[PDB]
């Protein structure tokens, strides 16, 4: 987040938590009342074959 | 008695568009995202049906 001065004031960590994943996708620093699709659940294999 | 018959709605389907062209590929994705917002907009207009 860039202020009127082009200071960076904030930021959101788009992999620290589910919120942070929300407001990453959504673009924006407040969420509103709701569910929202952020992302997708998948398994990562764990041995070469 | 007479019957009328009126469809209401539909299946809700929902489809993951990165998933979709790049199924498990980082090489593919990385060329994806050249494509700006495509991809999301996408998915937003599913999730509005
Ligand atoms: C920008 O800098 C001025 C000082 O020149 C300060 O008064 C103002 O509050 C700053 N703006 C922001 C958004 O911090």
Known sequence: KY???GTITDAVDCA?????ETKCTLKSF?????????????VQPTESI | ???????????KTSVDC????????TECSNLLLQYGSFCTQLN???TGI
Not at chain 2, 18 to 23: E, H, L, Q
């Open chain 1, 16 to 20: 620290l938590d589910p919120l942070s």
């Open chain 2, 1 to 11: 008695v007479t019957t009328e018959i009126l469809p209401v709605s539909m299946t």
């Open chain 2, 18 to 25: 990165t998933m979709y062209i790049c199924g498990d590929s």
């Open chain 2, 44 to 46: 937003r207009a599913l």
């Open chain 1, 3 to 5: 202020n009127e001065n």
């Open chain 1, 30 to 42: 407040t969420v509103e009342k709701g569910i929202y699709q952020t992302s997708n659940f998948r």
